[PDB]
């Protein structure tokens, strides 16, 4: 009990130290990396007490505001999920610390940058741990705004700002659904607590689950909400590595994971979740096939992974769905950091088409990127396997809609596809980056970082798949091609993508087909869903609302009316003249009437 | 006004409409009277032109108001609620809108004359004392 | 120039803590005893 | 009666103060009297606190009272550099307007007779008029004065006659007994006009979407000390009164709420939308203010206890955050006289700490957890949702746009390139930081202990 | 909390007695006003009373 | 160890029996009813807490 709360609270202290003069020193950040280090060291312990005996805990140390009936209070449930997840975040983020010390080493305000890092992570901890739903909302929204502060880090260029605003916007659109659900549980279940809600809702909830689903779509970048995530790469790399790889965006489905039994109450929820998660895997992966940024490709990848695990929830297997995240973080952090090594090495040139062929120029980064790509690919005993195979297999043997399963298949093909694209252009070719070569892999902390993530990247799949209690109950029978399919689809991926890529190498200019222009225009989706509705609204908010509705009628209807009528009346009564015969005769007739 | 008051309800629309026409004519003669009194027309024929104008206009307004009101009473057969006059109220402005040949003044007259009439009926229903 | 801001923080922190210490310690002494 | 006397007593102190020391006098003692005001907060968990025959202190009033006492020093700190070249007698005349004003507030919150409450409710109108008209900049202020004025009176006057009526149709006009002797009024037609007569003034003073036109045009004009009050308080007091008079009415409210719930539920999204495209900042803030007050007014009309809790919380939170945005904008307006938002440009580059305050202030404008703003808002969405399951689809859009424009005012007047030639800026005074720190700290401490702000229900 | 409850405030009792007396007084005024309106309508209606007679 | 102890309030006759115009009956009985209401809310708070306890306590 004391343990977990300590593995949270100590993280708070450096921010407190932020006003202390040490913050102004160059010396500060290493206290932070060390801080997360101790935090991790401490963080392992609850997991082990969780291991052999398996106990789980909730604490709610202090009620915050006792309403009638409802009395919300902060409450740190520490179940399987919340205990297992913390060491992961501490681990990868610690590696990001060590990375960032080098990636930014030139940069002024770097100390502030780390402050924002810890400030982000702590909110993430607020989200993963919280029992009481409202506390989940503070973790939610706070993570959102940290995303805003970090995306806009290079605040000078406008594009960073638009990206930030874009991200907050789609998150907010999800937040509408989150609030709808959040109200509905209170109106009905009278709760805001997972105990209450799990207890009282044996009955089917026809609607809250869908709005909550929309909220889950928020962070997770489903198909209707994907674009901000690709645009979020515009912030400096260690940031995008930090959370758009893993620590942020996975939380959006993590929410949905937390509420499995209610999902289980419905059929339509598992349904639609699958219905959409599949198609976002596909539609994202297609754009992922054909890009030129390192980071955009890796971004589309991460979202596609998210769609996959989203059907993993929608296939009614939450446990594996959570299992996939814990593997996923290592992979993606690996990719973005090695990519950061490339990019920093070359004076920052994201575009692959003038990215060199540097297989030998940076051999260690090469190794790293290779194990990474193989891990994401889903190689048979490497870490990505223990998720991906179990997943898609379970999807196979499950009763379900099939067309979505098909989509899972094309998607898992395309994984191999773009994953080979980046390898090919990054390394194999005779180099074509502009001459001079400032390249310098060397700087030991970076090395140590990538080392540790490789270590996890290879052992963790086996170790964790072994240690966890068998909540899965395995399906292992008919047929044989069942298990083969995951491999053969990959192999088709490498064969087609690679022979195609080599065919690109044979002169003969061609001009693009329509499919190329489509999938490489990110599905056209941003360029239509952004240049259109925003125009109709910003026009409408002036063509109408700002203007005629409220500056010109709403003022005409009662100030300008009376103000005019008094003009007429006042010039009429006070008619300036004053000839006697006039009004005097008026006295006459007014007497005759009176 | 006591004559006009015994509607009853809205039966025999003509009997009522004649009375409203009478009231409109009366007010028209008064307004014409002060107008002539305070705006010396010059050349008396123009003065009777003026009074013919106002008298006919107000008489028209009263007529159309009365009969649309009673017809609405004899058609909707609600027939007692205030809205029953309001159409006529709204109608009345349009009459006024026609003689002035202006959409604006006709439009405003529709709304305010309507609300005034509605308040009148509401008042008959509630015994509001005014004086 | 970053002088004016840091000065502001020096002041503000100095007062909030100036009164801050006696209060916190008073609360602690009240906790341990009475 | 103890807090109220010294508030009167500063006036002699102001007039007799040495000519160049007055700001210190008024500041220090206003702070002290704030602390004395704070002891009132205790209230009781059951019975409304009582005092003299002529005052009482419901939990609904106390946080407001504390706030109102709290604002005076702030307005002083803002004002005392805005004006300097003014003659001593005139300045000394000037703070009297402010303090006289809050005196009317401390009186009009504790009420108790609704006729006393009214006459003070309308008495507030004078000093704020004088301030808007004599010390506002640019020409339009003259015209603005009128809009600020008649819209109050045209609302207030019928309310007045209505009040007199009731104390004739029943016994006393006093609030406690009328809370107890309350009996339903119902349909007919006379009773409906009674309803509007007892609502329209309160629904004018906190702007309603169909009637809010004066409010932006007040804020465009008023010198900042007028702005802080006109925004942070008077709206909120109109809300306080409307929460008061709802002790009567019922069941009729069930039948008459609808039109105003339409003007409000639609006007919120609408005004927020207009808010998304202003030319100049000082107005942008004002429309944000209306866009939040609509939430209060539906929160009052659905009359569910959650809705009044949320009503109270949101009233106070919006008070502080709005005043904060105003002073925080006036600073720019003084540094560059631009007013138009486009000229400020890369203000963050040239100075940092103000950017931090922009961040905190806007950040709580959008309302994110666990700001009392947010928690104030979420309740009324809850009760609204109970009242109609559809209603959420409207509330959600609000929570969209209030994000956007809020962040917008941040990213447009800050992040980005400095304008080149604007050499005028001069590196942030201590009083500036002091001032806005004074807005924002209470606002954040206050989240720790909501239970003292949620009010009577 | 105890010390504050001593030095500054008080038990509810004073609040409660005060509220009692208040409600009594204001109630009495209320009923008197209504009765006064009765007396006045009658007295003007009849002239029988001392203080409306012309 | 100077120390506090619990306060309690005596019963009073309810509104139902005080007449249509006494304010003091309505008032005493009002405060009683109000106390009773707040109390009842607290009891529902307790039963919900025991509900949460049972929920988490199950494996």
Task: Give the distance, in angstroms, between the CA of residue D131 and the centroid of all CA atoms in the same chain.
Answer: 17
Geometric angle at alpha carbon A505, from A504 and A508, rounded to 5°: 75
Q: Which two tokens stand for residue A300?
A: 């589309």
Helix axes D372-387, A158-187, angle to 10 degrees: 50
Please tell me whether residue A64 adopts helix, strand or coil conformation. Answer: strand
Among chain F residues, the shortest Cα distance to A68 is held by F41
- Are A292 and A353 contacting, i.e. CB atoms less than 8 angstroms apart? yes
Contacts of residue D402, defined as CB under 8 A and 6 or more positions apart, other chains included, come to D272, D288, D291, D292, D365, D366, D367
Compute the distance between CA of residue D152 and CA of residue D130 in angstroms, rounded to an integer.
15
- Are B81 and B117 contacting, i.e. CB atoms less than 8 angstroms apart? no
- Are A131 and A58 contacting, i.e. CB atoms less than 8 angstroms apart? yes
In this complex, which of D42, D51, D180 lies closest to E9 when CB atoms are compared?
Answer: D42
Where would I find the H helices in chain E?
2-7, 12-46
Considering all CA atoms of chain E, what is the largest pairwise distance in Å, rounded to the nearest integer?
A: 68
Geometric angle at alpha carbon A297, from A293 and A301, rounded to 5°: 165
Among chain D residues, the shortest Cα distance to F22 is held by D181
- For D235, half-sphere exposure in the C-beta direction (CA atoms, 13 angstrom radius) is 36
Residue A74 — φ and ψ, nearest 5°?
-65, 140
Compute the distance between CA of residue B105 and CA of residue B97 in angstroms, rounded to an integer.
6
What is the DSSP secondary structure assignment for residue A54, as one 8-state letter? -
Query: Which residue, among D168, D177, D151, has the nearest Cα to D238 in the 3D structure?
Result: D151
Tokens 């300097």 sit on residue: D84
> How many residues does the structure list for chain C?
34
Chain C residues with CB-CB distance to D436 below 8 A: none
Compute the distance between CA of residue D45 and CA of residue D134 in angstroms, rounded to an integer.
45
Instruction: Output the CA–CA distances (angstroms, integers) from residue A80 to A195, A313, D204, F51, in the order listed.
Output: 15, 17, 55, 22
Compute the distance between CA of residue A272 and CA of residue A262 in angstroms, rounded to an integer.
14
The reply to whether residue B122 touches residue D189, judged by beta carbons under 8 angstroms, is yes
Compute the distance between CA of residue D53 and CA of residue E25 in angstroms, rounded to an integer.
9
Among chain D residues, the shortest Cα distance to C12 is held by D434
Instruction: Output the CA–CA distances (angstroms, integers) from residue A281 to A211, A306, D19, D212, in the order listed.
Output: 21, 8, 74, 48
Q: Using CB atoms and an 8 Å cut-off, which of residues 23-52 of chain F contact chain A?
A: 41, 44-45, 48, 51-52
Q: Are D and E close enough to touch, i.e. 3+ CB pairs under 8 angstroms?
A: yes
Contacts of residue B48, defined as CB under 8 A and 6 or more positions apart, other chains included, come to none
| F13: contact with D, CB 8 A cutoff | no
Contacts of residue D157, defined as CB under 8 A and 6 or more positions apart, other chains included, come to D201
Compute the distance between CA of residue D186 and CA of residue D69 in angstroms, rounded to an integer.
40
Compute the distance between CA of residue B112 and CA of residue B110 in angstroms, rounded to an integer.
6
User: CB neighbours (10 Å) of residue D10?
Assistant: 23
| H helix or E strand, kind and range, residue D331 | helix D305-336
CA distance F51 to chain D (A): 23
User: CB neighbours (10 Å) of residue B33?
Assistant: 17
Where would I find the H helices in D181-213?
190-205
Tell how strand D56-57 and strand D49-50 pair up.
antiparallel
| H helix or E strand, kind and range, residue A60 | strand A57-66
Compute the distance between CA of residue D309 and CA of residue D305 in angstroms, rounded to an integer.
6
> How many residues does the structure list for chain F?
59
Compute the distance between CA of residue A383 and CA of residue A371 in angstroms, rounded to an integer.
10
CA distance B36 to chain A (A): 9
Query: Which residue, among A50, A68, A73, has the nearest Cα to A4 in the 3D structure?
Result: A50
Burial of A485 (0-12, 13-18, 19+ CB in 10 A): middle
- Are A226 and A290 contacting, i.e. CB atoms less than 8 angstroms apart? no
Experimental technique behind these coordinates: cryo-EM
| H helix or E strand, kind and range, residue D34 | helix D22-38
With the CA atoms of A95, A96, A100 and A102 taken in that order, what torsion angle do they form, in degrees rounded to the nearest 10? 30
- Are E19 and D50 contacting, i.e. CB atoms less than 8 angstroms apart? yes
| H helix or E strand, kind and range, residue A359 | none
Chain D residues with CB-CB distance to E16 below 8 A: 47
Please tell me whether residue D236 adopts helix, strand or coil conformation. Answer: helix
Compute the distance between CA of residue A131 and CA of residue A82 in angstroms, rounded to an integer.
10
Q: Which two tokens stand for residue F4?
A: 């506090």
CA distance D434 to chain C (A): 8
Tokens 């809370």 sit on residue: D179
Touching subunits for chain B (3+ Cβ pairs under 8 A): A, D
Q: Using CB atoms and an 8 Å cut-off, which of residues 150-179 of chain D contact chain E?
A: 167-168, 170-172, 174, 176-177
Its sign, for the CA torsion A206, A211, A217, A219, is negative
Please tell me whether residue A193 adopts helix, strand or coil conformation. Answer: coil
The resolution, in angstroms to one decimal, equals: 5.4
Task: Give the distance, in angstroms, between the CA of residue D13 and the centroid of all CA atoms in the same chain.
Answer: 28
The reply to whether residue D190 touches residue B82, judged by beta carbons under 8 angstroms, is no
Contacts of residue A300, defined as CB under 8 A and 6 or more positions apart, other chains included, come to A230, A284, A285, A287, A288, A291, A418
Helix axes D4-16, D22-38, angle to 10 degrees: 170
Among chain D residues, the shortest Cα distance to E14 is held by D50
| F56: contact with A, CB 8 A cutoff | yes
Geometric angle at alpha carbon A147, from A142 and A153, rounded to 5°: 130
Instruction: Output the CA–CA distances (angstroms, integers) from residue D210 to A238, D122, D221, D265, D451, in the order listed.
Output: 50, 21, 21, 12, 34
Among chain E residues, the shortest Cα distance to D45 is held by E12
Instruction: Output the CA–CA distances (angstroms, integers) from residue A212 to A174, A208, A264, A269, D282, in the order listed.
Output: 8, 6, 14, 10, 37
Tell how strand D56-57 and strand A71-78 pair up.
unpaired
Query: Which residue, among B112, A545, A561, has the nearest Cα to D209 in the 3D structure?
Result: A545
Compute the distance between CA of residue A249 and CA of residue D5 in angstroms, rounded to an integer.
58
Q: How many helices (H) and strands (E) does chain D have?
A: 20, 2
User: CB neighbours (10 Å) of residue C18?
Assistant: 9
Among chain E residues, the shortest Cα distance to F7 is held by E11
Compute the distance between CA of residue A515 and CA of residue A502 in angstroms, rounded to an integer.
19
Cα R_g (chain D), whole angstroms = 21
Please tell me whether residue D280 adopts helix, strand or coil conformation. Answer: strand
In this complex, which of A561, A582, A593 lies closest to B30 when CB atoms are compared?
Answer: A593
- For E46, half-sphere exposure in the C-beta direction (CA atoms, 13 angstrom radius) is 9
Compute the distance between CA of residue F56 and CA of residue A378 in angstroms, rounded to an integer.
37
CA distance D189 to chain B (A): 7
Q: Which two tokens stand for residue A408?
A: 């899972």
In this complex, which of F23, F26, F31 lies closest to D46 when CB atoms are compared?
Answer: F31
Q: How many helices (H) and strands (E) does chain A have?
A: 26, 2
Query: Which residue, among A236, A152, A231, has the nearest Cα to D348 in the 3D structure?
Result: A152
Task: Give the distance, in angstroms, between the CA of residue A507 and the centroid of all CA atoms in the same chain.
Answer: 41
- Are A138 and D369 contacting, i.e. CB atoms less than 8 angstroms apart? yes
Compute the distance between CA of residue A88 and CA of residue A40 in angstroms, rounded to an integer.
9
Contacts of residue D343, defined as CB under 8 A and 6 or more positions apart, other chains included, come to D336, D419, D422
Please tell me whether residue D246 adopts helix, strand or coil conformation. Answer: coil
Compute the distance between CA of residue F34 and CA of residue F38 in angstroms, rounded to an integer.
6
Q: Which two tokens stand for residue D141?
A: 């202020």
Task: Give the distance, in angstroms, between the CA of residue D428 and the centroid of all CA atoms in the same chain.
Answer: 27
Tell how strand D49-50 and strand A71-78 pair up.
unpaired
Expressed in angstroms, the distance from the first to the final Cα of chain A is 94
Instruction: Output the CA–CA distances (angstroms, integers) from residue D418 to A364, D224, D228, D366, in the order listed.
Output: 43, 26, 29, 26
CA distance E26 to chain D (A): 7
Chain D residues with CB-CB distance to B125 below 8 A: 189
């Amino acid at each position: 009990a004391s343990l977990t709360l300590t593995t949270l609270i100590i993280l708070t202290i450096p921010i407190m130290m932020s006003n202390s003069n040490i913050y102004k020193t160059n010396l500060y950040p290493n206290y932070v990396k060390t801080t997360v280090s101790y935090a991790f060291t401490l963080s392992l312990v609850p997991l082990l007490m969780f291991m052999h005996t398996g106990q789980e805990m909730i604490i709610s140390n202090w009620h915050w505001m006792t309403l009638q009936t409802v009395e919300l209070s902060l409450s740190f449930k520490m179940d399987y999920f919340s205990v297992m997840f913390i060491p992961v975040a501490l681990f990868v983020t610690w590696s990001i610390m060590e990375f960032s010390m080098w990636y930014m080493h030139s940069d002024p305000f770097i100390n502030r940058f780390f402050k924002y890092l810890v400030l982000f992570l702590i909110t993430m901890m607020i989200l993963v741990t919280a029992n009481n739903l409202f506390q989940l909302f503070i973790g939610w929204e706070g993570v959102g705004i940290m995303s805003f502060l970090l995306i806009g880090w290079w605040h000078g260029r406008t594009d960073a700002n638009t990206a930030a605003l874009q991200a907050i916007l789609y998150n907010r659109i999800g937040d509408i659904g989150f609030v709808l659900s959040m109200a509905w549980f209170l109106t009905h279940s009278n709760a805001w607590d997972l105990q209450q809600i799990f207890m009282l809702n044996n009955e089917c909830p026809n609607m809250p689950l869908i709005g909550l689903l929309l909220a889950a779509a928020g962070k997770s970048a489903q198909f209707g909400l994907h674009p901000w995530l690709p645009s979020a790469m515009e912030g400096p790399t260690p940031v995008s590595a930090l959370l758009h790889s893993s620590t942020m965006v996975v939380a959006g489905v993590f929410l949905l994971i937390r509420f499995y039994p209610l999902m289980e109450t419905n059929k339509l929820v598992q349904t639609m979740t699958l219905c959409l998660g599949a198609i976002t895997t596909l539609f994202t992966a297609l754009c992922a096939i054909t890009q030129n940024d390192i980071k955009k490709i890796v971004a589309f990848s991460t979202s596609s992974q998210l769609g996959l695990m989203m059907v993993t929830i929608g296939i009614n297997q939450p446990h594996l769905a959570f299992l996939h995240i814990c593997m996923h973080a290592f992979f993606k952090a690996m990719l973005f950091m090695c990519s950061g090594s490339i990019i920093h090495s070359l004076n920052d040139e994201q575009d692959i088409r003038k990215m060199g062929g540097l297989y030998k120029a940076m051999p260690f980064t090469t190794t790293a990127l290779i194990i990474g790509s193989l891990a994401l690919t889903g190689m048979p005993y490497l870490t990505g396997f223990y998720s991906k195979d179990l997943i898609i297999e379970a999807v196979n043997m499950s009763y379900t809609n099939a067309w979505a399963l098909l989509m899972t298949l094309i998607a898992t093909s395309l994984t191999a596809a773009y994953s080979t694209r980046i390898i090919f252009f990054a390394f194999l070719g005779k180099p074509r980056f502009p001459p001079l070569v400032l390249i310098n892999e060397n700087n030991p902390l970076l090395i140590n970082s990538i080392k540790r993530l490789l270590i996890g990247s290879i052992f963790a799949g086996f170790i964790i798949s072994n240690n966890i209690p068998p909540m899965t109950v395995p399906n292992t029978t008919m047929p044989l091609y069942m298990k083969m399919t995951a491999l053969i689809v990959t192999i088709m991926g490498f064969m087609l993508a690679l022979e195609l890529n080599n065919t690109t190498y044979y002169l003969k200019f061609k001009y693009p087909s329509q499919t190329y222009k489509f999938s490489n225009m990110l599905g056209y989706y941003p360029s239509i869903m952004h240049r259109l509705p925003t125009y109709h609204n910003l026009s409408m908010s002036q063509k109408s609302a700002s203007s005629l509705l409220d500056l010109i009628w709403l003022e005409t209807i009662l100030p300008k009316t009376t103000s005019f009528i008094q003009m007429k009346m006042s010039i009429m009564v006070s008619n300036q003249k004053g000839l006697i015969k006039l009004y005097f005769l008026s006295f006459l007739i007014t007497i005759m009437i009176s | 006004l006591h004559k006009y008051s015994d509607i009853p309800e809205g039966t025999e629309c003509h009997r009522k409409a004649y009375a409203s026409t009478s009231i409109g004519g009366a007010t028209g003669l008064i307004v014409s009277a002060y107008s002539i009194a305070l705006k010396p027309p010059a050349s008396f024929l123009e003065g009777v032109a003026r009074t013919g104008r106002y008298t006919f206009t107000s008489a028209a307004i009263g007529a159309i108001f009365g009969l649309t009101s009673c017809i609405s009473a004899q058609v909707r057969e609600k027939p007692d609620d205030p809205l029953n006059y309001f159409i006529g109220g709204c109608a009345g402005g349009l009459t006024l809108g026609a003689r002035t040949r202006s959409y604006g003044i006709g439009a405003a007259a529709c709304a305010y004359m309507g609300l005034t009439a509605a308040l009148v009926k509401m008042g008959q229903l509630e015994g509001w004392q005014v004086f | 120039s970053g002088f004016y801001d840091r000065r502001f923080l020096k002041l503000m922190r100095f007062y909030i803590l100036l009164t801050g210490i006696p209060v916190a310690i008073g609360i602690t002494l009240v906790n341990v005893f009475i | 009666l103890k807090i109220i006397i010294p508030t009167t007593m500063l006036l002699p102190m102001t007039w007799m103060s040495k000519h160049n020391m007055i700001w210190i006098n008024a500041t220090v003692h206003s702070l002290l009297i704030s602390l004395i005001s704070l002891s009132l907060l205790n209230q009781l968990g059951e019975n409304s606190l009582n005092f003299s025959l002529t005052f009482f202190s419901d939990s609904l009033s106390a946080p407001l009272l504390v706030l109102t006492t709290w604002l005076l020093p702030l307005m002083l700190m803002a004002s005392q550099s805005h004006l300097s070249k003014e003659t001593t007698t005139r300045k000394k005349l000037y703070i009297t307007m402010l303090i006289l004003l809050q005196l009317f507030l401390i009186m009009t919150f504790t009420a108790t007779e609704l006729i006393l409450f009214y006459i003070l409710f309308e008495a507030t109108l004078v000093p704020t008029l004088i301030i808007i008209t004599r010390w506002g900049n640019q020409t339009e202020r003259l015209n603005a004065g009128l809009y600020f004025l008649f819209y109050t009176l045209a609302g207030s006057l019928p309310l007045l006659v209505a009040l007199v009526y009731i104390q004739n149709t029943t016994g006393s006009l006093n609030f406690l007994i009328i809370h107890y002797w309350s009996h339903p009024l119902s349909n007919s037609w006379s009773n409906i006009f009674m309803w509007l007569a007892c609502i329209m003034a309160f629904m004018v003073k906190m702007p309603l979407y169909g009637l809010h036109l004066w409010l932006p045009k007040a804020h465009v004009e008023a010198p900042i000390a007028g702005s802080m009050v006109l925004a942070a308080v008077l709206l909120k007091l109109g809300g306080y009164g409307m929460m008061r008079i709802t002790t009567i009415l019922n069941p009729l409210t069930n039948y008459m709420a609808y039109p105003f719930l339409m003007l409000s539920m639609w006007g919120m999204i609408m005004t927020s939308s207009i808010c998304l495209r202003q030319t100049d900042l000082k107005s942008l803030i004002a429309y944000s203010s209306v866009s939040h007050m609509a939430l209060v007014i539906v929160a009052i009309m659905i009359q569910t206890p959650w809705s009044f809790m949320g009503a109270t919380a949101l009233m106070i939170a919006h008070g502080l955050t709005s005043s904060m945005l105003f002073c925080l904008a006036n600073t720019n307006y003084e540094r560059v006289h631009s007013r138009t938002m486009i000229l400020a440009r890369g203000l963050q580059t040239l100075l940092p700490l103000m950017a931090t305050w922009w961040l905190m202030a806007s950040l709580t404008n959008l309302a994110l957890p666990p700001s009392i703003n947010l928690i104030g808002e979420l309740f009324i969405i809850t009760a609204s949702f109970s009242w109609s399951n559809i209603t959420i689809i409207l509330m959600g859009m609000n929570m969209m746009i209030t994000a956007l424009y809020s962040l917008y005012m941040l990213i447009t007047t800050q992040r980005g390139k400095y304008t080149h030639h604007i050499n005028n800026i001069k590196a942030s005074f201590t009083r500036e930081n002091a001032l806005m720190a004074l807005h924002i700290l209470p606002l954040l401490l206050l989240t720790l202990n909501p239970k003292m702000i949620l009010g009577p229900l | 909390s105890r010390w504050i409850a001593r030095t500054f405030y008080d038990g509810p009792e004073k609040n409660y007695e005060k509220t009692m007396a208040i409600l009594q007084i204001e109630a009495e005024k209320a009923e008197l006003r209504l009765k006064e309106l009765e007396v006045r309508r009658l007295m003007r209606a009849r002239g029988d009373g001392p203080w409306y007679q012309y | 160890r100077y120390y506090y102890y619990h306060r309690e309030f005596r019963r009073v006759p309810d509104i139902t029996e005080c007449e249509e115009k006494d304010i003091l009956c309505m008032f005493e009985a009002e405060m009683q009813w109000r106390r009773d209401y707040k109390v009842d809310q607290e009891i529902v708070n307790i039963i919900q807490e025991r509900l949460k306890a049972c929920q988490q306590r199950e494996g």
